[PDB]
């Protein structure tokens, strides 16, 4: 019976497809580790796939995966229990240390680049001739944190050139320096920009960028991780 054959064949094909898909999905984060960083004894029934290499544009190199994995940064956490499977308490200030929901990854300390090799993200002032085309222009608005205090004022928007979208608000603080706030973490209102994630005293602690007209993948990770971390860690000073 041909249909019997087809269905039986299909299920064999699907077992193979799922094996292929699961192993493809092990190109990052494996081998599994124990809480102390060493290889775990049980790696499960799926073995790592043969590595593959991505050629990165603009002379940025290649990436081969799976490859040796490491955090490449210190992790200020310690065990809270004598056996596996419990949480790890922050050893200092988890926002400053960048752990928990405040975590960042040691991504490349270069800016993401567009298909022409230009910086993907720029302050709008340096982006010819990008402008607000719809919605409330946030530039000039006071910025308020979850303590309902004013933290600073919006002085620009950083935009993704190739995708024509707003990515960050640049916010000037009381001392005259600025910080980037992710577009996804602000509520633009008629008279203010509101930030639920941070109280006003946490703005100064937002990670700074090194060059005032670009931002690197590493810097984006620190800023975003830090702002998101405020949901958990600023919660004492909020208040709605």
């Amino acid at each position: 019976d041909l249909a019997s054959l087809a269905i039986y064949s299909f299920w064999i094909f699907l077992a193979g497809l799922i094996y292929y898909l699961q192993t493809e999905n092990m190109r990052e984060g494996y081998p599994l580790e124990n809480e102390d960083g060493t290889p775990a004894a049980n790696q499960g029934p799926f073995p790592l796939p043969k590595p593959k290499t991505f050629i990165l544009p603009h002379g940025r190199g290649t990436l081969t995966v799976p490859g040796p994995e490491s955090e490449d940064r210190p992790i200020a956490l310690a065990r809270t229990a004598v056996s596996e499977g419990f949480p790890h308490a922050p050893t200092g200030d988890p926002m400053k240390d960048g752990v928990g929901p405040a975590s960042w990854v040691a991504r490349r300390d270069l800016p993401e680049l567009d298909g022409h090799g230009h910086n993907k993200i720029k302050p709008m002032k340096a982006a010819a001739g990008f402008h607000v085309s719809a919605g409330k222009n946030p530039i000039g608005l006071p910025v308020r944190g979850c303590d309902l205090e004013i933290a600073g004022k919006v002085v620009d928007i950083w935009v993704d050139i190739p995708e024509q979208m707003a990515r960050f608000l640049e916010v000037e603080l009381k001392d005259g320096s600025t910080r980037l706030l992710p577009m996804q973490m602000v509520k633009v209102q008629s008279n203010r920009v509101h930030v639920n994630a941070l109280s006003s005293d946490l703005f100064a602690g937002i990670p700074t960028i090194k060059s005032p007209t670009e931002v690197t993948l590493l810097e984006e990770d620190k800023i975003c991780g830090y702002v998101a971390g405020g949901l958990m860690y600023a919660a004492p000073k909020r208040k709605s």
């Binding site: 599994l32 809480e35 790890h88 752990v99 929901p101 298909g115 190739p162 958990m232």
Partner: protein, 281 residues
């Protein structure tokens, strides 16, 4: 037991109930209060199904079937062996699903991410509830709900549909179907596009998201963009289910005749109802 990058995220906090009491993992799985609730609901539910299987006198997975009360019980209880198990298993199911969603919320909070996922999942739960709860209640009996069995739930779909003629003519069903098909279309295209950029022709560099926009503009004159496509996939698949639930909650309540006759309202409009020729004159 941990992904190479995982430990920095396994901090305390984010739980909704119980403070630190259940704030831990078992292998990969987070627990939480709702992990315990899920296990309790699911376990009780699975035990009751096995008991239903005994009373039915079968262990075959293709035969086991747990039926809701016969229509005569209305919206009241039924002896265990005659609809009561169904009723308890349904409460367990519901408990399990809502517990799963709420565990997902605890996970979001620990990870500092948005709640989109448990929100999306709550659409699926709402659909299940439409069929086993909202619709049977509005119609006046549990027996209108589908039974829990692999082939018997399909008998229920077929029987329920053919109660109203060809169920294709349910207009809410037509919209739902359109969202399902379009969703699979968008899914294929999204998967294909990302992969085609990441895995370009032999020896070439990875394409960029600018190439992704370009390919789609070249192809059809438009590209929704990388944020937009993920907005879209979510909208399409939740819309599909919103309309699935709609299409059933209106069926047997506000509309209970043959769905194909619903369309007569349009043909019978005064200004053309009587002009001869075409199909309906």
């Amino acid at each position: 037991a941990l992904l190479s990058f995982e430990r920095k995220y396994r901090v305390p906090g984010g739980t909704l109930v119980g403070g630190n009491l259940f704030d831990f993992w078992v292998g990969p799985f987070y627990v939480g209060f709702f992990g315990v609730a899920t296990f309790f609901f699911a376990a009780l539910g699975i035990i009751l199904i096995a008991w239903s299987a005994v009373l039915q006198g079968t262990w075959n997975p293709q035969l086991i079937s747990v039926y809701p009360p016969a229509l005569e019980y209305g919206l009241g209880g039924a002896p265990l062996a005659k609809g009561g198990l169904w009723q308890i298993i349904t409460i367990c199911a519901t408990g399990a699903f809502v517990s799963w969603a709420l565990r997902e919320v605890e996970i979001c909070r620990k990870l500092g991410i948005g709640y989109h996922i448990p929100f999306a999942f709550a659409f699926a739960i709402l659909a299940y509830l439409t069929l086993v709860l909202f619709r049977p209640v509005m119609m006046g009996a549990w027996g209108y709900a589908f039974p829990y069995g692999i082939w018997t739930h399909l008998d229920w779909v077929s029987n329920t549909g053919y109660t109203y003629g060809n169920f294709h003519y349910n207009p809410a069903h037509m919209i739902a179907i359109s969202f399902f098909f379009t969703n699979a279309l968008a899914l294929a295209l999204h998967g294909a596009l990302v992969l085609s950029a990441a895995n370009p022709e032999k020896g070439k560099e990875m394409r960029t998201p600018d190439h992704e926009d370009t390919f789609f503009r070249d192809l059809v004159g438009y590209s929704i963009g990388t944020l937009g496509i993920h907005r879209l996939g979510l909208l399409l698949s939740l819309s599909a289910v919103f309309f699935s639930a709609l299409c059933m909650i209106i069926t047997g309540t506000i509309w209970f005749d043959q769905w194909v006759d619903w369309w007569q309202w349009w043909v019978k409009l005064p200004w053309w109802a009587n002009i001869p020729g075409g199909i309906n004159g």
